[PDB]
Design a protein around this nucleic acid. Structure first.
Ligand SMILES: [Mg+2]
Ligand SMILES: [Mg+2]
Lengths: 109, 52, 141, 34, 41, 324
RNA sequence: ACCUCGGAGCAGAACCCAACCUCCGAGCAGUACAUGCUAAGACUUCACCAGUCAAAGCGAACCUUUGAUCCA
RNA sequence: AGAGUGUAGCUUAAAAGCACCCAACUUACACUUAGGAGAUUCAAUUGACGCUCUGA
């Protein structure tokens, strides 16, 4: 009487652990809901996958979570916290490796 | 249900694009970007393509 | 000519070099968190119970240009340091200090209610008429 | 419509009522704690 | 004529705290109003 | 398994069973302030920062406040949101009172201290003023971090400061063309008698800014040093180059910095004039060149890749014909 | 009775894991009509097919599941 | 008579931050926006003006 339930796994999770070198555009982690939040130089897709916006080293950190005020449910959740409480989340950052360019001598006019 | 319809440019171009509108709803007139003209123009529903 | 001995690669050490060329990186992440870190300089306004303060802070967190009604030089010219007049005055002082510091472009990140606030509107008007633009140029990739 | 003098008197009225009821609540709280 | 009715719910009183609370209520009633300390249901 | 925390876990101190009796964040802004405070606080876990890092005067002030309060017109203007402030008076008062601290902040942000004194800091006590006379009617000032074109900086500036000797120096922290660390001096007046500057000893004559084209924006620093007793000192780049670090090391015993004022200079046609007429050399032109785009190692079979894959790795866009 | 797809447990913590296994759900709707065009770099349901995400750029503006080829 | 002594309600704040209030939105609370008041007890680290405690 139990049908369905034959769906395969989504192969989600972290694709780049901490310290892994990541080029711009590489997907860092795919998640179904926000297990890891985007940090510095990390973007978010429609499906909440984290990709590197710059070329660098992936780092995972814990930071205080302050949601966008337009996120009404999160704002209410915060409104219900006690005074000392601060929410925390796991964030993924890309520490950019190369400089974004150098000045070169082109012509000795 | 909804029906797929062919909005045809009122700008005289041969340009048409397919939209979805409820069968019970009135015939559609919609502003849309015409690539050939390179400007937003009116498109009018011409004929029903299919029922979806 | 020994004066024409120039290293093939130039090394500009000015911290604001790339930022002013509009080529420096901005922290483009933090989509799920408020405020965005995608800026070079941010205008942060703190309205305490008694004093109104404004800061122009670099992305790295260094405070670059501050204007606080707490300072005697400014509080010695206005009645209440916690009203629209105080906000506009601190905004104009900050605009002047920003111009003298070379900070023409800035990002302001208010909450919806902060934006709706008339005092914040007056502060933004003061800054824009003083010259500072509350919208940073896009990065050039 | 209204004039400037009446508006100023209204503002001073609000100020003095603020002071008066501030004294009121201060004395009420003093009695409370005492 | 009509009489407008209001309710206030309260929970948590101490011995002396209840005394101060209702004596303040008694002394701060402006003009011709009806108080009550009735319970639920 | 579970490793115990290496320190006080957040939200642990206030962890109590009296949640109902605990006051809550009624507002979003107070939570934001607390969150910013916690973010600033140090932590034992990995964090973003780790990786991306008299009394009479007071009485007079109180009396002045009471006088401003007493003035009813001021209250009317305040409540009509029409009052304003004297910008010049505020500027002067701030300069006298706490302007040096803000100028030290600006210098630290601009990196002058780390690049001039290797991190050794000071405070610009003297409210120095510099202005490059533009034409004859006006003179563009040089604040802390101003923006002045080399055309306006073509001629030596007029300097004013209420003080009593002084040594004034101008350096270009980033104009050097050969060595990244060195810098060029433009003009150095030494043993200034009091305020008048025309009587200063001109050790190195004046040069205008010469930031090469497309070489970004250069920061030029006016340093001013209090001088106890005069000391004898000592258009060629080889002799304009030096390090303010060891220079001021050689004179720190009787010299101490007391004034600063710096500005940003871009390219300008006056720079071409400077490079040709008197420096007598070809002007260098610099271009900001970004690193080549990264592409993964090319595969023999780019499975599922579009046709553009081959273009990503071809270098010449023009058709080639091999042996034919 | 079932045959495809998806969610939860088995399968606790990267991924992955069956069943006549224990439960649940879907064959689209609402929206708009840039919900356009292009394009680095990536993910991928263990193959392929198919399916995802996406910087930069251009152009308007200021979206949240079902099926191939041939054939018409 | 003696001890502790002492910033507006609180501050290992140095004249600041939290607290506090009215006005509008709220049934109401709350939020937000506008405004409001506030102190380092007097003399030279020290003595004496005020508070708490120990006794009669
Ligand atoms: Mg399953
Ligand atoms: Mg695969």
């Amino acid at each position: 009487k139990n049908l369905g339930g034959k769906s395969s796994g989504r192969r989600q999770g972290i694709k780049k652990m901490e310290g892994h070198y990541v080029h711009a555009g590489n997907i860092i982690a795919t998640q179904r809901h926000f297990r890891w939040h985007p940090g510095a130089h990390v973007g978010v897709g429609k499906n909440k996958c984290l990709y590197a916006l710059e070329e660098g080293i992936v780092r995972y950190t814990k930071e205080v979570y302050v949601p966008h005020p337009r996120n009404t449910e999160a704002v209410d959740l915060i409104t219900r916290l006690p005074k000392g409480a601060v929410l925390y989340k796991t964030f993924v950052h890309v520490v950019p490796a190369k400089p974004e360019g150098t000045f070169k001598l082109v012509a000795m006019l | 249900k909804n029906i797929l319809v062919r909005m045809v440019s009122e700008a005289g171009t041969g340009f048409c694009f397919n939209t979805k509108r409820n069968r019970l709803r009135e015939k559609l007139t919609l502003l849309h970007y015409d690539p050939v003209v390179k400007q937003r123009v009116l498109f009018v529903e011409k004929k029903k393509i299919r029922s979806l | 000519v020994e004066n024409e001995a120039v290293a093939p690669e130039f090394t500009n050490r000015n911290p604001r070099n790339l930022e002013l060329l509009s080529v420096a990186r901005k922290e483009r992440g933090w989509r799920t968190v408020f405020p965005s870190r995608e800026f070079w300089h941010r205008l942060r306004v703190i309205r305490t119970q008694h004093h109104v303060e404004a800061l122009v802070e670099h992305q790295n967190g260094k405070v670059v240009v501050s204007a606080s009604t707490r300072e005697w030089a400014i509080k010695k010219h206005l009645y209440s340091t916690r009203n629209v007049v105080a906000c506009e005055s601190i905004g104009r002082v900050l605009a002047q200090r920003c111009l003298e510091a070379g900070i023409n472009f800035m990002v302001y990140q208010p909450t919806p209610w902060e934006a709706a606030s008339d005092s914040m509107k007056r502060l933004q008007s003061a800054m824009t008429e003083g010259g500072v633009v509350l919208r940073e140029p896009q990065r050039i990739y | 419509e209204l004039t400037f003098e009446e508006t100023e008197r209204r503002a001073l009225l609000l100020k003095k009522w603020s002071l008066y009821k501030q004294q009121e609540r201060k004395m009420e709280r003093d009695t409370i704690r005492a | 004529l009509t009489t407008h009715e209001r309710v206030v719910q309260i929970s948590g009183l101490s011995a002396t705290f209840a005394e101060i609370f209702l004596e303040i209520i008694q002394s701060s009633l402006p003009e011709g109003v009806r108080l009550s300390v009735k319970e639920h249901t | 398994r579970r490793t115990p925390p290496l320190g006080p876990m957040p939200n642990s101190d206030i962890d109590l069973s009296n949640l109902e009796r605990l006051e809550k964040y009624r507002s979003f802004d107070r939570y934001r302030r607390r969150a910013e405070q916690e973010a600033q606080a140090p932590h034992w876990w990995r964090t973003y920062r780790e990786y991306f890092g008299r009394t009479q005067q007071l009485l007079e002030r109180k009396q002045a406040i009471q006088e401003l309060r007493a003035n009813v017109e001021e209250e009317r203007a305040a409540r009509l949101r029409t009052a304003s402030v004297p910008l010049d008076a505020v500027r002067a008062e701030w300069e006298r009172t706490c302007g040096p601290y803000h100028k030290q902040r600006l210098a630290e942000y601009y990196g002058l201290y780390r690049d001039l004194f290797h991190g050794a800091t000071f405070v610009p006590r003297v409210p120095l003023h510099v202005a490059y006379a533009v034409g004859e009617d006006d003179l563009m000032p040089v604040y802390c971090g101003n923006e002045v074109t080399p055309t306006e900086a073509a001629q030596a500036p007029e300097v004013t400061y209420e003080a009593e000797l002084w040594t004034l120096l101008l350096t270009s922290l980033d104009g050097h063309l050969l060595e990244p660390d060195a810098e060029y001096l433009h003009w150095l007046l030494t043993n200034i008698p009091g305020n008048r500057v025309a009587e200063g000893q001109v050790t190195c004559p004046y040069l205008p800014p010469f930031p090469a084209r497309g070489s970004g924006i250069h920061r030029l620093a006016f340093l001013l040093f209090k001088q106890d007793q005069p000391i004898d000192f000592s258009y060629q780049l080889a002799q304009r180059t030096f390090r303010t670090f060891d220079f001021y090391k050689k004179h720190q015993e009787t010299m101490t910095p007391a004034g600063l004022s710096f500005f940003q200079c871009r390219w300008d046609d006056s720079v071409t004039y400077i490079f040709h007429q008197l420096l007598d050399m070809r002007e260098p032109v610099f271009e900001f060149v970004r690193p080549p785009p990264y592409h993964p190692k090319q595969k023999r079979f780019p499975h599922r890749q579009p046709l553009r894959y081959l273009d990503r790795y071809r270098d010449s866009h023009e058709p080639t014909y091999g042996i034919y």
